[PDB]
Amino acid sequence: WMPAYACQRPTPLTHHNTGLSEALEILAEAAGFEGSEGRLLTFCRAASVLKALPSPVTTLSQLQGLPHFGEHSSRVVQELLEHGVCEEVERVRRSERYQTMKLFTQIFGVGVKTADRWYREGLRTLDDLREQPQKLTQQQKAGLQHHQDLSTPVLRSDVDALQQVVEEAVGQALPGATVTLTGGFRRGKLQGHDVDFLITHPKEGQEAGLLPRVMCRLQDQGLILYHQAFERSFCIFRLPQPGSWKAVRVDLVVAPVSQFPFALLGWTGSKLFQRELRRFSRKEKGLWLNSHGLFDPEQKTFFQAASEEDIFRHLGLEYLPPEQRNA
Template identity: 65%
Template structure:
């Protein structure tokens, strides 16, 4: 499902230099390494990222094939285990299993080769291995204390308990009690990582970050199927009102609390007090029905196609990566986040106003607020990296875009001005974030989430490694140096952590 009619393209056909994603890739350099043929497996990597990496490698003189063939010498995978890669290769080779098998490598070999401009020697750390059972798979009582040390899948065995604890965490946040909010979230995160369901309260003994209050909630649910405390919270007028108000685009806890104290309770109350609303909140209320409904994965993919089209028109060779919950494997969410970069540092600067102008000319933009980057304002690297663990300084745009069901009903013909979107569609929250290539790995890690996983990763960095981590970089205060990273794997390596794939970061 595309948002704009596909344009006829000239030049290379599918599977050639344009890349599988259709991006205008950097011009390929003369082939420098005839003995190396790379195949980038799309599984877990994604179409857009694969196209970006393909163009990057070809620009450095590597041969990268779009389809697997016996000539492939190096298969590069991202977020796959040796078991998954072996099964994939068996399916690809079929009855030709006697053929020489290629090297099966993780993304670290590729990123190191790109950094050096030549194929680096294959070492043990580059090879895909069957992972050893983690403590979370063997003994629930020996789970690591930090969520960034645990594999946390999207689907887990203790949903009724985690939903109850998340309700109490949310209510604590509405009351400004950050300590209780974090305590309940840590307890819920532990339950998500367990290899099986909790059936007896004795199983909670020895679990990290699991206090008496959380244990009482679980025990009550085990014995009665319901928690009286959780039900009281859910039925309270304050909780319901705060939940309603904080679902409005542009409204945080402080604003919602202020409105509640002023006696406001409903959207109708707010619509009668328009002087209390800023432009973002007005847009949030105007499109509340759409924005409070789920965005499905196929809708996120449709939005990605139109964003890519706009970005590539403005900056050929750029990459557009879907982040957030969708990158962690979710099939639905409430907004869509994209991270944009370009292999040439600095080319990405000032990109968003041009992209949003193009989308606006197509009748797609219902609201936008663009923030220019300001990380260069920081006088020193330590200041930059330690500024905040929640907010970064990248160029970004908070927007509401229109997702039509009938693309041709809104797309303007050449020479026409913007058209009003038809009623046949929905409004969707979309964030665009632009990062320079030198900081891309940190931005990708930070914008993938989950929020609790990121909080724990930064807490681990400070408490266990005495380093400062955020979406711009990793800084070692004692050595007064920044640690570079070409990939997320590099960041985990710097911290001495096992790499956790995005699909296992649902803490």
């Protein structure tokens, strides 16, 4: 009754097992900080199964038969049901390793590998890193300077204002080009830690060379606090605030219109949903999916899609709107 892949079931943004899923996600995150991608995936998948359930789990019984619940994830749930806390989860939460790896990986320009090296070198705080600025790339310097602003969520109000400024630059760069809001906001989130836009043009090929032209125009308007032929730009933008402004992460992506459904699908997420969807495509259907297309490796052909609905149909999956992709 519960399918094994997250792309086979609706997953709403809000649900009935919030505390249980949050605890499993702490363990998933900690597994990632240790380089255990397999354990991260299992804990993420188990958390996502709980998000997809129609009511709260109240008894351990109710996990029997659910995919991705074995001895470890079931024991976590059991401890939470019986005591309101799970000792393993709380030990992770308060550990110096978890807290520092979380802080460091939050920095734009710092991943697990860099964070882990710094941790092993004895660094623990953002001010530790600031004192050693020759250890830092230009990207990391920007991430560190702007870390406080980037730690505060963006509201949907802010997003609409940003979209209008991006649309103005895009229209000068290439009249007729369009801007679509993707990422978590397209899935219905009311807040988020960045904003994602997908840009195309209805005439195939006109979008070639577009992103540099857009970036130059936004920089000329004084809106770009940090960036840098290309088709994805990971920026920090100046967002107006009453009497001042704040830094916001914005991603801009260009795709040809032939690829737009695939890029829209990919950039709308969630991250787990897209990993599960690509895994399903390859392992169950023998087709290879990315943000550019869907390849049949036996006929050596690409599926044409005119819509996300087309892609779900190609893959034999019932359509899920973005609001049900919150795996």
